[PDB]
């Protein structure tokens, strides 16, 4: 497990862009991670997306996954960042199904695929109550701000 | 059972002070309600309470409870307009364990009575079924603007 | 007198949860404190409490008193804080009238007793010397 | 006296740019107003001006003054939902910084209007000491 | 040639999630649009992404493009989308980021119409700063109504 | 040229009051400076100034000019960064606005050293959009310790 403070030792992200509230399982060997992001109406983006109809942005669901991928990529090499960041460089298959709503517990999954040099590929899935909500193959480049 | 949109039809509260994200059960016959508030680090009060140690203000837990009760009240009398149940007191209130980002604050409100338009509710808040806060909420019907 | 920066040396709270704008009197022999919070429509919480009807949340009034209480606690023992007085409970908490934009929320906190790490304060809040809220605040002095 | 709800009926400004918390006196006879803005540490502009040193931006003191003038203007012509656009000032001066916990007193005295160009004599004070003073010039629009 | 007010007539997005500041060219016969988003340090997301190292989130560039696409949509089918109607971002194949967008940059947004089988629309979008390629992707929206 | 980080080494201003997004020209010999501030609808003040009619507060334009002047002041005397010094805005003359700045505009900031009497500086300042005048004033500062 990992609470918000540990999470913040791995991600430089801060308000209003830290989209991982907890990491429930770190399958150290399976090279995969399970974490969630509580979706609440008391978040800053809801008012603008959209007035009268709150729907968590999809791009934000993407960002949530990449952030989880990042944590994983670090724990795998049993290290503690320095600044060091898994820069979101691209993505292939990227899809959404049902929309995420206030009150939902966005579940995040990321599985290690490859890594050619500095590039990393992850297979990420976001789900609400087991029902799939998003899926994409995230691509990151280990960089240093 | 009601989502954020239904919730906002009974509570006049708005961002950044709407602290009930969903109502799982509204037993109008038993005159009680069960709902919750998702605690996320991505909320505006965390940066200030406290930097480097996110802890949901207890006063917000009270606020979340009073809002839970409020929904029940409005429902009990089909009260829509906007006026609310003005939080006027509590004889006893206690906190146990702090609430943290990631928690799902479970809210319980049970209608007790109403004399002179003064409502008393019996509320409890819990996380992972462990008790977090309990208190007797006193609200008094009033029109916003009075 | 204590300006906002001295207050921030004692209270770890920050925007948008620092609810004491100035400490005006500190009576240590009598174990009481007088401070205040300025209410302004230019505060983040007003847009949501409530649209077209700005009223300072009662819970925030409580928060302001608990915060003033803590300053008093540290002051009573010459402490120069990572200690925090956690709000662990309250007895007979009551609100008389609502606090509105333009008001100067006066905060009074008086030491009642202490049993180890559990402190009890007698608190009141007033606008133009009129009662607005009162309660017995219970705090637990703990490491943040 | 005018509370915040009435003020919001004469000014189109809304959070985070409504800088008049209360109108204590509105002298329609003398064509002048007396209002104030409560300065609290819980305002959005303090974190950025400045970290460790909270000082109300002089420009917001100017804006607060212009806004008090605007309430006078609208009262005078009984204007409901236009705007009193800030077009200038000739001599503007700041004497001391305004800090958290200060009650920013705002004074506006109507001077004249010609071709829809309004001119007001403004002053701001804290604990009755002078903080700012300037001649605000506005022009109706929208 | 649309300003911010006209834009808010087509997109239901509002603060802090409206990322199209101006439409410089709307070529309907060419089924393509050109708009931009002024990037300023004075925006809510920079403090969190990242402290002392401001970099516009890539995901927000994707969002900016999906918004420009939506504006092109409505204009194409000559409608006045005054009814919460929206182009719900459903997916995207091949998405790339070629360099960080920083404050002061003027995010140039380009969206080219492609297909439209049933209610699912497809757009070929590119983002550039100082004419240099920044991002590129294939946005797939699914017209629905909130 | 100066990017946002360099700018933040000279100016202590932070969100939401940093109004210089980039410095394009620093002419020491001529004692002038050219910088700009990107105006985006995605900024905290627009919602309040005004709802449905976004206009950049003229006073913020003043602030933006004073901030650019400060940078000029330091560069002129080769003053190394974070000095803990602030060019405190203490007064002005001939302040005039000729037209509103709107979302999408790139506010151009010009500041020209006029004279210095010990700690009191005077600058000749102008702001423009698309090279057309928007604001002008003589900015008087007092170099003091933050």
* Three-state DSSP state, D93: strand
Cross-chain CB nearest to C93 (options B44, B89, B95): B89
Q: Are strands D32-38 and D83-94 parallel, antiparallel or unpaired?
A: unpaired
In chain D, residues 99-138 whose CB comes closer than 8 Å to chain F: none
Find tokens 């959070």 and name the residue: D15
CB C134 within 8 A of CB C125: yes
CB E137 within 8 A of CB E64: no
Q: Measure Cα distances from F105 to C134, D103, D110, F127 in Å.
A: 52, 35, 34, 12
Taking contacts as CB-CB distances below 8 angstroms, the residues of chain C near D38 are: 38-40, 101-104
CB D28 within 8 A of CB D75: yes
* Cα–Cα distance, A17 to E14 (Å, whole number): 18
Q: Are strands A105-112 and A32-38 parallel, antiparallel or unpaired?
A: antiparallel
* Three-state DSSP state, E59: helix
Residues E57-76 as b/e (b if ≥16 CB within 10 A, e otherwise) read bbbbbbbbbbbbbbbbbbbe
Q: Which of F133, F126, F128, F123 is nearest to F108 (CA)?
A: F128
Neighbours of E45 (CB within 10 A): 19
* Three-state DSSP state, A91: strand
First-residue to last-residue Cα distance in chain B? 32
Q: Measure Cα distances from A113 to A80, B141, E92 in Å.
A: 21, 59, 20
Assess C97–D contact: CB distance below 8 Å, yes or no: no
CB-count burial class (<10 Å; 0-12, 13-18, 19+) for E93? middle
- What kind and span of H or E run contains C73? helix C58-76
CB F83 within 8 A of CB F71: no
Taking contacts as CB-CB distances below 8 angstroms, the residues of chain F near E3 are: 102-104
- Cα D134 to chain center, whole Å? 11
Taking contacts as CB-CB distances below 8 angstroms, the residues of chain F near E4 are: 41, 54, 102-104
Residues A55-89 as b/e (b if ≥16 CB within 10 A, e otherwise) read bbbbbbbbbbbbbbbbbbbbbbeeeeeeeebbbbb
- Cα F89 to chain center, whole Å? 11
Residues C77-86 as b/e (b if ≥16 CB within 10 A, e otherwise) read eeeeeeebbb
* Cα–Cα distance, B40 to A21 (Å, whole number): 6
* Residues forming beta bridges with residue B111, ordered by sequence position: B121
Chains contacting chain D through 3 or more C-beta pairs under 8 A? C, F
Neighbours of B133 (CB within 10 A): 25
| Neighbouring residues of E78: CB distance < 8 A, sequence distance ≥ 6 | none
Question: Are F4 and E106 inside 8 Å of each other by CB?
Answer: no
Token pair in block for residue F109? 């900031």
Neighbours of E108 (CB within 10 A): 20
Would you give the DSSP letter of residue C45? G
* Method by which the coordinates were obtained: X-ray
* Residues forming beta bridges with residue B37, ordered by sequence position: B105
Q: Please provide the DSSP assignment of B99-123 as one string.
A: --TT-EEEEEEEEEEESSSEEEEEE
* Cα–Cα distance, A144 to E14 (Å, whole number): 33
Residues of F that are catalytic: 49
Question: Are B102 and A3 inside 8 Å of each other by CB?
Answer: yes
Q: Please provide the DSSP assignment of C87-120 as one string.
A: EEEEEEEEE-S---TT-EEEEEEEEEEEETTEEE
Would you give the DSSP letter of residue A99? P
* Cα–Cα distance, F19 to F109 (Å, whole number): 10
Q: Measure Cα distances from A128 to A57, A132, B81 in Å.
A: 15, 6, 34
A131-144 β-sheet, strand order: A22-27, A32-38, A105-112, A119-128, A131-144, A84-96, E85-97, E132-145, E120-129, E106-117, E32-38, E22-27
CB D74 within 8 A of CB D84: yes
* Three-state DSSP state, D136: strand
Token pair in block for residue A103? 């009150």
Cα dihedral: F125, F126, F127, F133 (round 10): 170
By C-alpha distance, the chain C residue nearest B134 is C89
Structural domains of chain F ordered from first start: 3-146 (3.10.129.10)
| Neighbouring residues of D43: CB distance < 8 A, sequence distance ≥ 6 | C40, C42, C43, D16
* Three-state DSSP state, D57: coil
Angle, CA D133 vertex, CA D132 and CA D134 arms, to 5°: 135
Cross-chain CB nearest to F48 (options D18, D94, D142): D18
Chains contacting chain A through 3 or more C-beta pairs under 8 A? B, E
Q: Please provide the DSSP assignment of chain F as one string.
A: -B-HHHHHHH----TTS----EEEEEETTTTEEEEEEE--SSSTTGGGS-TTS----HHHHHHHHHHHHHHHHHHHTT--S--SEEEEEEEEEEEEE-S---TT-EEEEEEEEEEEETTEEEEEEEEEETTEEEEEEEEEEEEEE-
Token pair in block for residue F23? 């410095």
């Amino acid at each position: 497990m990992m609470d918000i403070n540990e999470i913040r030792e791995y991600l430089p992200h801060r308000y209003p862009f830290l989209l991982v509230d907890r990491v429930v399982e770190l399958d150290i060997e399976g090279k995969r991670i399970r974490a969630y992001k509580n979706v609440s109406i008391n978040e800053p983006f809801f008012n603008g997306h959209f007035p009268e109809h709150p729907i968590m942005p999809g791009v934000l669901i993407i960002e949530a996954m990449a952030q989880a991928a990042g944590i994983l990529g670090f724990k795998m090499l049993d290290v503690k960042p320095a600044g060091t960041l898994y820069y979101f460089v691209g993505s292939d298959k990227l899809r959404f199904r049902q929309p995420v709503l206030p009150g939902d517990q966005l579940q995040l999954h990321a599985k290690f695929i490859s890594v050619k040099r500095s590039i990393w590929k992850f297979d990420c899935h976001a789900t609400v109550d087991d029902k799939p909500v998003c899926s994409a193959e995230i691509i990151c480049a280990e960089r240093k701000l």
